[PDB]
Amino acid sequence: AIQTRTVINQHGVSETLVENFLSRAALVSKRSFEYKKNFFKWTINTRSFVQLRRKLELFTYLRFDAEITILTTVLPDLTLQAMFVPTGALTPEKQDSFHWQSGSNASVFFKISDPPARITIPFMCINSAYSVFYDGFAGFEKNGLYGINPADTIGNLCVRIVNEHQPVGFTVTVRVYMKPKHIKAWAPRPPRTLPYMSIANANY
User: 32 is in the binding site of which of another protein, a copy of itself, none (Cβ under 5 to 8 A by kind)?
Assistant: a copy of itself
For residues 108 and 83, what is the distance between their CA atoms, to the nearest angstrom?
A: 7
Nearer to another protein, 14 or 168 (CB): 14
Residue 114 gets which letter from DSSP?
A: S
Give all strands of the β-sheet with 27-35 in edge-to-edge order: 27-35, 170-178, 68-73, 117-118
- Map residues 20-49 to x or -, x wherever contact with a copy of itself holds by CB under 8 A: ----xxxx--x-x----------------x
| Binder among 46, 97, 102, 153 for a copy of itself (CB under 8 A) | 102
Question: Binder to a copy of itself among 3, 16, 193, 198 (CB under 8 A)?
Answer: 3
Choose the one of another protein, a copy of itself, none that binds residue 135, judging by a C-beta under 5 to 8 angstroms depending on kind: another protein
Q: How far apart are the first and last CA of the chain?
A: 35
Beta-ladder partners of 130: 62
Cβ neighbours of residue 7 closer than 8 Å, sequence gap 6 or more: none
Contacted by 61, from another protein, a copy of itself, none: CB < 5 to 8 Å by type: another protein
Mark 131-170 with x for binding to a copy of itself (rule: CB under 8 A) and - for no binding.
Answer: -------xxxx--x-----xx----------xxx------
The span from the CA of 184 to the CA of 200, in Å, is 25
